[PDB]
Amino acid sequence: VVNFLLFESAVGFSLFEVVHQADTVGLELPEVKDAMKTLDKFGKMVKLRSFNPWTSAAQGLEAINLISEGIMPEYLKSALEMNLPQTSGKKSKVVLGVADKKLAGEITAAFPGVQCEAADTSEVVAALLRGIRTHANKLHKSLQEGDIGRAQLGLGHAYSRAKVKFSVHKNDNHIIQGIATLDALDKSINQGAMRVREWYGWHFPELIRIVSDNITYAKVVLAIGNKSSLTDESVDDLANVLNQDQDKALAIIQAAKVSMGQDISEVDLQMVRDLASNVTSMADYRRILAESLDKKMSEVAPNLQVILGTPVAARLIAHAGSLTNLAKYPASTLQILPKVKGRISRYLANKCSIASRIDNFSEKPTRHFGEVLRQQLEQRLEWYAKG
Amino acid sequence: DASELQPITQKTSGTELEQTILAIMEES
Amino acid sequence: GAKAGKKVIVEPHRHKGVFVARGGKEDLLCTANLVPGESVYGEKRISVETPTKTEYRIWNPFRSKLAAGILGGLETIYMKPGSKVLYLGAASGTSVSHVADIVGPTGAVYAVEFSHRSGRDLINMATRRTNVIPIVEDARKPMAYRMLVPMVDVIFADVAQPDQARIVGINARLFLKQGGGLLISIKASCIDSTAPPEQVFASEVQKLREDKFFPKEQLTLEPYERDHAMVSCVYLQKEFEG
Amino acid sequence: AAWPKAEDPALVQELLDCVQQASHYRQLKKGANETTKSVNRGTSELVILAADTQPLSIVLHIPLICEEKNVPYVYVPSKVALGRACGVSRAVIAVSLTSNEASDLNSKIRALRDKVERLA
Amino acid sequence: ALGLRTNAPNADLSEILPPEIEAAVKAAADISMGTEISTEDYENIKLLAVQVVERSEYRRQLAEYLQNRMKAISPNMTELIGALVGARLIAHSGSLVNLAKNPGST
Amino acid sequence: AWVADKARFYLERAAPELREWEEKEIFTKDEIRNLVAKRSDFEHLVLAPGTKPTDFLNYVNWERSLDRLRAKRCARLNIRSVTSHASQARTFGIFERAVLKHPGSIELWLAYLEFAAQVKATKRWRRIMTRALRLHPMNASLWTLAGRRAAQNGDMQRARAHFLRGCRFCTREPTLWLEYARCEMDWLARMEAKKPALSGAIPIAVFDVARKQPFWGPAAAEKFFDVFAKFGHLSCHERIISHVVTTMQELFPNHPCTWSVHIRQPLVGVDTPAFPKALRESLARLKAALQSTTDRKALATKMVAWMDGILAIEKLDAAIRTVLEHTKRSL
RNA sequence: ACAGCGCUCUGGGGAAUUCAGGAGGGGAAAGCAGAUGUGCCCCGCGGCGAGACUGGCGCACCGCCGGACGAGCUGCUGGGG
């Protein structure tokens, strides 16, 4: 005969007081199973008595950790002390129903006057908690803040990530998405620089003729203003751009003096210089991405970084998808990702897969294994030079 | 009778606050 | 074979949620992708230009016993889109990704795995897909994730343990609705490595009927996996839903 | 990290004897990449990894696909003994011994994998 | 403006979008499920977001320039339909005179 | 939905009191038809599937208002036989199935507690309070209501037990801990007015455990000092205040809150020659705090709030008024 | 077209609309197993319960099993004021 029963849920645990308990002898009957199924014949069995939510997601994580380990938590002991009538089993006990037998034993050793019944051992409390877990979305809804799906989602992620220690050594998503950003804005930079190159050489073609390096082009067009305001070594700029006094500045000024491009309007020059500022901002952000990505590559997978080099190694990582896929791939599938070229290519694929599995299955990887492998590659390079 | 909340004793004291409150109420 | 770039058409299969993609010289099985453009384990995916965000993923039957069963011709699979599925033995989440895509955004898929590194892969898959929740715990002790798992409608079992029937027995006794569908994948070489396969399947079906299900179907998925069998049963009823 | 470590008393030696028998029967695959490819193709009946290899990440990546495809994998602590049992005259660290439809080696495999499934 | 989710409770966001939404985003920031990321990568995310906001402001002032320029060139078409679609027509025709050579159905 | 049947039971329960009101000359038959029709509509809405605590509350308000109007008409017609017994019984029935149908609505729980405390059911009130605390443990307002009404009754042990269970539960916000310290020092005050407690060490004990509770902060200690500084007319109040300020010095050496309590420390029992001397003392402490190394903006905002309180107090000197105006203006 | 076969026959189709039923899905606290106003004190019976006793057993010896008093608190729709 049951009196109260605990029920631990994701948002928190609640204890119900049973009224008009179920028959334990005819428990395998279609009528009592139908009554357990429907809701209008189970709310007569179960009446809600006490609820306790978690205070914070860290506290709920602590709840799952202690409960799955079997040890009751202190605030669960507090809530049971609040709800159960105070007694020791000298003359009158209280029957509780819980799911885990170890939790039953611990609650019994905490409160002497509470005899627990385990869902593992007693079919009546088994069927009772089964009905409650089935209709759990309706019984709590009068005080259920929100719904239960998102809480179960987040609580399961918190518990499993705490058991795995996942975010300490998962960073491959940052690596691959950085690579995709890098080559995306590299293409965008190339296209925008070509655009401003044509779009300003319409006004001044000798600058196109004499200055390559479209980033330096964007810099010098942000610098030059209009075709009519030229002096060679004005302030702080051309000597750190390029050679200053005797190589290019006089050439540019002379090309402007002989130049026959169209005059440009003020607002058109403003728009051109805004586009050039845009291009140089993306180029500066590119070099920032490259530096931070080299450092992150050295932190994540250093053996690949020293064998292949960061750009192509991260291309391989990006194409495989993650370090786990890269390591799970054998050598020849990694090859899919004369005769000397084929020989050194298969050899390099083998050493690449070795570096991948090392740098993935370490916790915090090291560098000297990749240094030893690169030394072996250089020695095979000398071996093929012997030919 | 779980009708109301009965006052605490040393048997049913959970936290350090309740322990010290009962210590002071004993030493008074 | 089914080379990348061939044009196929996509028709809906008889089951609710699986599509069959037929085209050219090979017909294959696919599920609607939940997150577009990002393959999980390097599978082939089909793009459809609707008159973008819709794409299908090709289900490898040799690698997933559920896809093997559906090509083998199961009568039903009990997992309509929106029905909660408890998956036991969710190693690295390939078939679990497929089941999550079948169930869709309104349901949920409770992937229970045990090995920690397969758990890491499963954590990655569950960060990507928002309707699968992962649980890294030993499936023999459901008192661990009894706080996480609510009353699901389908139980998939892909464990090969000698205690397979008892494992699914306690997990269904704790987390399965009245008349609850389940599928189990039985590997004879692991259940009884001495015995013949038909006798092994008969023994396991009898152990399930002792553990209070009712078996409705059993097929030997022979052209995809040797000495296997997929057994479909219902928990504590004769019809599936109600 | 190699928690299915095979213990000393004669289980390691039954493993090595079975590996040598399979090498003679040509039902055996040696090497890390060949074990990986046999496990991916699903022919692998059992797989043994050395535990004294230079850094353990290699014979750590094999158990990932092994657990994904549910094959019995064990660790034997001697790669030189593994090579001398395979009959290579070089040190192997990964051996996947496969399944046929007819032998007595299959019965020895069944007994051995029963023991290692009890081990796990 | 929002830093990390740990910096979300001390965040000031009412200048970009009024509340009844920018409190729901604080709720989602407290009970999200995403992994924790280092500030060494949040710097990269923040610089990229600065970059894309600069691109959007450049697009907006480019559209203002385009409206001014189409108003300067052909005020009749701008008073008719608008500088944007006028610019599309000038683009597809190649030149203003090449468009003026086209009949109405074209 | 057998709500016709359930409403039939409740109206057949309500019928004989209406027969009493008809055999007396208190309500006439047209009024009684209006009453039974309104009661039928109310009972059907209450037992309907889709219901709301606002609907239960409006039915409660109608039945209670009918009880009041019946009392007015009875006292006007000079009768004494008709009592309020059936009316209070049916009101209790409405509230009981109200909290059954919607247990999680603290609005309805508080209205039910208000009704019990109004019509004089103290034991019933303790039972209702116990059930509501079991359903809403994290409600600082409910815990304070229980503890304060128990201390108003005089059950110091019961008010204790309520507050101790409350601070065992509600650990996130310090409001309940402030309320327990407030009630404990009110008990010390009631004992001093009646004239261990000679020490008065229970608020110090509450402080010592509040230091390790996870709400423990500078502003939390500031609230503690505020509720300690109210009603300073006591015996060991200076001992308590000194222990608080020494603990805050030992923990937060340069926090602007600690400087604020060092500013307002010697102003415990001031209202009169004892007032301006402590005023000058705290003015010296304030100037030292304003010139010392501390977050001057936060400290001065605390100080101008404090001086807003001071200027809200009247009956002061014009000279000190002008110098407080100047010191507030220089911030 | 002949021949054959099947269904169906107030001939057969499409549509609007009225009525009589059936099956399936989703939703809903969807909750009348014994419906009695509140408070006090007294009687009866029952619980906690600090503390004080006492009998028997105890060949791994370390401990067990049992009677009967009880301050204080408290329950009762048991009946009476």
PDB file of N, CA, C and O in Angstrom, chain A residues 324 327-332 350 354 357-362 369, chain D residues 32-33 36-37 40 54-58 60-62 64-65 68:
ATOM      1  N   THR A 324      37.708  14.388 -36.592  1.00  0.00           N
ATOM      2  CA  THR A 324      37.305  13.002 -36.407  1.00  0.00           C
ATOM      3  C   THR A 324      37.127  12.296 -37.745  1.00  0.00           C
ATOM      4  O   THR A 324      37.574  11.155 -37.907  1.00  0.00           O
ATOM      5  N   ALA A 327      40.634  11.699 -39.247  1.00  0.00           N
ATOM      6  CA  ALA A 327      41.356  10.574 -38.674  1.00  0.00           C
ATOM      7  C   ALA A 327      40.714   9.249 -39.050  1.00  0.00           C
ATOM      8  O   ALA A 327      41.422   8.267 -39.290  1.00  0.00           O
ATOM      9  N   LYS A 328      39.381   9.199 -39.118  1.00  0.00           N
ATOM     10  CA  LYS A 328      38.709   7.967 -39.511  1.00  0.00           C
ATOM     11  C   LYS A 328      38.950   7.620 -40.966  1.00  0.00           C
ATOM     12  O   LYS A 328      38.752   6.465 -41.354  1.00  0.00           O
ATOM     13  N   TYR A 329      39.335   8.584 -41.774  1.00  0.00           N
ATOM     14  CA  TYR A 329      39.623   8.226 -43.150  1.00  0.00           C
ATOM     15  C   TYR A 329      40.973   7.524 -43.252  1.00  0.00           C
ATOM     16  O   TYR A 329      41.941   7.942 -42.617  1.00  0.00           O
ATOM     17  N   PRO A 330      41.061   6.461 -44.039  1.00  0.00           N
ATOM     18  CA  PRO A 330      42.355   5.809 -44.269  1.00  0.00           C
ATOM     19  C   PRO A 330      43.256   6.656 -45.147  1.00  0.00           C
ATOM     20  O   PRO A 330      42.895   7.776 -45.513  1.00  0.00           O
ATOM     21  N   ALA A 331      44.423   6.131 -45.510  1.00  0.00           N
ATOM     22  CA  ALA A 331      45.372   6.935 -46.268  1.00  0.00           C
ATOM     23  C   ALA A 331      44.925   7.176 -47.703  1.00  0.00           C
ATOM     24  O   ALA A 331      45.107   8.280 -48.230  1.00  0.00           O
ATOM     25  N   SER A 332      44.323   6.180 -48.342  1.00  0.00           N
ATOM     26  CA  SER A 332      44.030   6.305 -49.763  1.00  0.00           C
ATOM     27  C   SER A 332      42.823   7.204 -50.009  1.00  0.00           C
ATOM     28  O   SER A 332      42.777   7.943 -51.000  1.00  0.00           O
ATOM     29  N   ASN A 350      50.164   9.019 -46.346  1.00  0.00           N
ATOM     30  CA  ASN A 350      50.339   8.200 -45.151  1.00  0.00           C
ATOM     31  C   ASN A 350      50.773   9.049 -43.968  1.00  0.00           C
ATOM     32  O   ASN A 350      50.182   8.978 -42.880  1.00  0.00           O
ATOM     33  N   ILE A 354      48.775   9.959 -40.367  1.00  0.00           N
ATOM     34  CA  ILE A 354      49.413   9.769 -39.067  1.00  0.00           C
ATOM     35  C   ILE A 354      49.343  11.049 -38.243  1.00  0.00           C
ATOM     36  O   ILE A 354      48.984  11.028 -37.053  1.00  0.00           O
ATOM     37  N   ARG A 357      45.623  11.598 -37.006  1.00  0.00           N
ATOM     38  CA  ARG A 357      45.182  10.793 -35.877  1.00  0.00           C
ATOM     39  C   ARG A 357      45.900  11.192 -34.596  1.00  0.00           C
ATOM     40  O   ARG A 357      45.267  11.227 -33.536  1.00  0.00           O
ATOM     41  N   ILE A 358      47.180  11.574 -34.677  1.00  0.00           N
ATOM     42  CA  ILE A 358      47.885  12.006 -33.470  1.00  0.00           C
ATOM     43  C   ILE A 358      47.277  13.289 -32.924  1.00  0.00           C
ATOM     44  O   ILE A 358      46.901  13.365 -31.746  1.00  0.00           O
ATOM     45  N   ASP A 359      47.144  14.306 -33.777  1.00  0.00           N
ATOM     46  CA  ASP A 359      46.664  15.599 -33.314  1.00  0.00           C
ATOM     47  C   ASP A 359      45.200  15.574 -32.920  1.00  0.00           C
ATOM     48  O   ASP A 359      44.759  16.463 -32.187  1.00  0.00           O
ATOM     49  N   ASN A 360      44.434  14.588 -33.381  1.00  0.00           N
ATOM     50  CA  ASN A 360      43.049  14.509 -32.943  1.00  0.00           C
ATOM     51  C   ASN A 360      42.921  13.741 -31.640  1.00  0.00           C
ATOM     52  O   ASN A 360      42.169  14.145 -30.749  1.00  0.00           O
ATOM     53  N   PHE A 361      43.631  12.632 -31.502  1.00  0.00           N
ATOM     54  CA  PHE A 361      43.394  11.793 -30.342  1.00  0.00           C
ATOM     55  C   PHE A 361      44.289  12.129 -29.175  1.00  0.00           C
ATOM     56  O   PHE A 361      44.178  11.489 -28.128  1.00  0.00           O
ATOM     57  N   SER A 362      45.170  13.106 -29.317  1.00  0.00           N
ATOM     58  CA  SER A 362      45.740  13.675 -28.112  1.00  0.00           C
ATOM     59  C   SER A 362      44.707  14.552 -27.411  1.00  0.00           C
ATOM     60  O   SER A 362      43.680  14.923 -27.980  1.00  0.00           O
ATOM     61  N   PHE A 369      56.482  15.434 -32.721  1.00  0.00           N
ATOM     62  CA  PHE A 369      56.155  14.323 -33.608  1.00  0.00           C
ATOM     63  C   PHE A 369      56.033  14.790 -35.047  1.00  0.00           C
ATOM     64  O   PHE A 369      56.551  14.145 -35.967  1.00  0.00           O
TER      65      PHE A 369
ATOM     66  N   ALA D  32      47.532  -1.033 -40.144  1.00  0.00           N
ATOM     67  CA  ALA D  32      46.513  -0.099 -39.685  1.00  0.00           C
ATOM     68  C   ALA D  32      45.526   0.240 -40.792  1.00  0.00           C
ATOM     69  O   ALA D  32      44.308   0.161 -40.590  1.00  0.00           O
ATOM     70  N   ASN D  33      46.030   0.590 -41.973  1.00  0.00           N
ATOM     71  CA  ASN D  33      45.146   0.980 -43.063  1.00  0.00           C
ATOM     72  C   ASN D  33      44.315  -0.196 -43.554  1.00  0.00           C
ATOM     73  O   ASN D  33      43.132  -0.035 -43.877  1.00  0.00           O
ATOM     74  N   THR D  36      41.568  -0.763 -41.159  1.00  0.00           N
ATOM     75  CA  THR D  36      40.551   0.267 -41.323  1.00  0.00           C
ATOM     76  C   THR D  36      39.653  -0.035 -42.508  1.00  0.00           C
ATOM     77  O   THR D  36      38.423   0.056 -42.408  1.00  0.00           O
ATOM     78  N   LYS D  37      40.249  -0.437 -43.627  1.00  0.00           N
ATOM     79  CA  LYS D  37      39.459  -0.706 -44.821  1.00  0.00           C
ATOM     80  C   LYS D  37      38.625  -1.971 -44.675  1.00  0.00           C
ATOM     81  O   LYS D  37      37.489  -2.016 -45.159  1.00  0.00           O
ATOM     82  N   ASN D  40      35.678  -0.992 -42.444  1.00  0.00           N
ATOM     83  CA  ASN D  40      34.718  -0.205 -43.211  1.00  0.00           C
ATOM     84  C   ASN D  40      33.940  -1.057 -44.194  1.00  0.00           C
ATOM     85  O   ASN D  40      32.740  -0.841 -44.376  1.00  0.00           O
ATOM     86  N   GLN D  54      54.190   3.152 -30.608  1.00  0.00           N
ATOM     87  CA  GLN D  54      54.481   4.567 -30.554  1.00  0.00           C
ATOM     88  C   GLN D  54      53.188   5.324 -30.856  1.00  0.00           C
ATOM     89  O   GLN D  54      52.326   4.795 -31.555  1.00  0.00           O
ATOM     90  N   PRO D  55      53.080   6.616 -30.440  1.00  0.00           N
ATOM     91  CA  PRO D  55      51.891   7.088 -29.700  1.00  0.00           C
ATOM     92  C   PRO D  55      50.531   6.495 -30.038  1.00  0.00           C
ATOM     93  O   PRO D  55      50.128   6.418 -31.201  1.00  0.00           O
ATOM     94  N   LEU D  56      49.783   6.156 -28.987  1.00  0.00           N
ATOM     95  CA  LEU D  56      48.617   5.279 -29.020  1.00  0.00           C
ATOM     96  C   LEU D  56      47.448   5.801 -29.856  1.00  0.00           C
ATOM     97  O   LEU D  56      46.401   5.153 -29.938  1.00  0.00           O
ATOM     98  N   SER D  57      47.606   6.957 -30.493  1.00  0.00           N
ATOM     99  CA  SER D  57      46.507   7.552 -31.236  1.00  0.00           C
ATOM    100  C   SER D  57      46.068   6.719 -32.438  1.00  0.00           C
ATOM    101  O   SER D  57      44.890   6.756 -32.801  1.00  0.00           O
ATOM    102  N   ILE D  58      46.964   5.930 -33.022  1.00  0.00           N
ATOM    103  CA  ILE D  58      46.631   5.125 -34.196  1.00  0.00           C
ATOM    104  C   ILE D  58      45.658   4.012 -33.819  1.00  0.00           C
ATOM    105  O   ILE D  58      44.516   3.915 -34.314  1.00  0.00           O
ATOM    106  N   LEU D  60      44.139   3.988 -31.309  1.00  0.00           N
ATOM    107  CA  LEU D  60      42.979   4.626 -30.724  1.00  0.00           C
ATOM    108  C   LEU D  60      41.959   5.029 -31.775  1.00  0.00           C
ATOM    109  O   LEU D  60      40.759   5.039 -31.481  1.00  0.00           O
ATOM    110  N   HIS D  61      42.396   5.346 -32.999  1.00  0.00           N
ATOM    111  CA  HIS D  61      41.407   5.714 -34.006  1.00  0.00           C
ATOM    112  C   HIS D  61      40.701   4.492 -34.560  1.00  0.00           C
ATOM    113  O   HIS D  61      39.546   4.597 -34.986  1.00  0.00           O
ATOM    114  N   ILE D  62      41.380   3.346 -34.603  1.00  0.00           N
ATOM    115  CA  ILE D  62      40.705   2.111 -35.040  1.00  0.00           C
ATOM    116  C   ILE D  62      39.500   1.751 -34.174  1.00  0.00           C
ATOM    117  O   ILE D  62      38.452   1.389 -34.739  1.00  0.00           O
ATOM    118  N   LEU D  64      37.347   3.661 -32.950  1.00  0.00           N
ATOM    119  CA  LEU D  64      36.201   4.521 -33.231  1.00  0.00           C
ATOM    120  C   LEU D  64      35.291   3.900 -34.280  1.00  0.00           C
ATOM    121  O   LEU D  64      34.090   3.715 -34.047  1.00  0.00           O
ATOM    122  N   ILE D  65      35.852   3.538 -35.432  1.00  0.00           N
ATOM    123  CA  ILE D  65      35.059   2.848 -36.437  1.00  0.00           C
ATOM    124  C   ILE D  65      34.688   1.453 -35.949  1.00  0.00           C
ATOM    125  O   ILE D  65      33.626   0.927 -36.308  1.00  0.00           O
ATOM    126  N   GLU D  68      31.700   2.013 -33.940  1.00  0.00           N
ATOM    127  CA  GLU D  68      30.609   2.461 -34.795  1.00  0.00           C
ATOM    128  C   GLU D  68      29.984   1.292 -35.537  1.00  0.00           C
ATOM    129  O   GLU D  68      28.765   1.252 -35.725  1.00  0.00           O
TER     130      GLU D  68
END
